[PDB]
Curated annotation (Swiss-Prot):
Domain of life, per lineage: Eukaryota
Name under which the protein is recorded: Omega-hexatoxin-Hv1a
GO biological process: defense response
Function, as annotated: Reversibly and voltage-independently blocks both mid-low- (M-LVA) and high-voltage-activated (HVA) calcium channels in cockroach DUM neurons. Is lethal to many insect species but not toxic to mammals. May target the insect high-voltage-activated calcium channel Dmca1D. Also inhibits acarines calcium channels. An extremely high toxin concentration partially inhibits Cav1.2/CACNA1C, Cav2.1/CACNA1A and Cav2.2/CACNA1B calcium channel of rats.
Record site feature (Critical for insecticidal activity), residues: P10, N27, R35
Organism of this sequence: Hadronyche versuta (Blue mountains funnel-web spider)
Domain remark from Swiss-Prot or TrEMBL: The presence of a 'disulfide through disulfide knot' structurally defines this protein as a knottin.
Length: 37
C-alpha cells in the first residue's frame, strides 16, 4: 500500500519517512538524494 516510505527507500522530506528520519545518500550517478533511515 502507498503508506510511509520504509527504510532504504527514497524519501522527499523527513515528514514522509516511516521512521520520520530522512537522510541524504550519494548515488552512482554522482548525485545525492534523500532516503529513509
Amino acid at each position: 500500500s502507498p503508506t510511509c516510505i520504509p527504510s532504504g527507500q527514497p524519501c522527499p522530506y523527513n515528514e514522509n519517512c516511516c521512521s520520520q528520519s530522512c537522510t541524504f545518500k550519494e548515488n552512482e550517478n554522482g548525485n545525492t538524494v534523500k532516503r529513509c533511515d
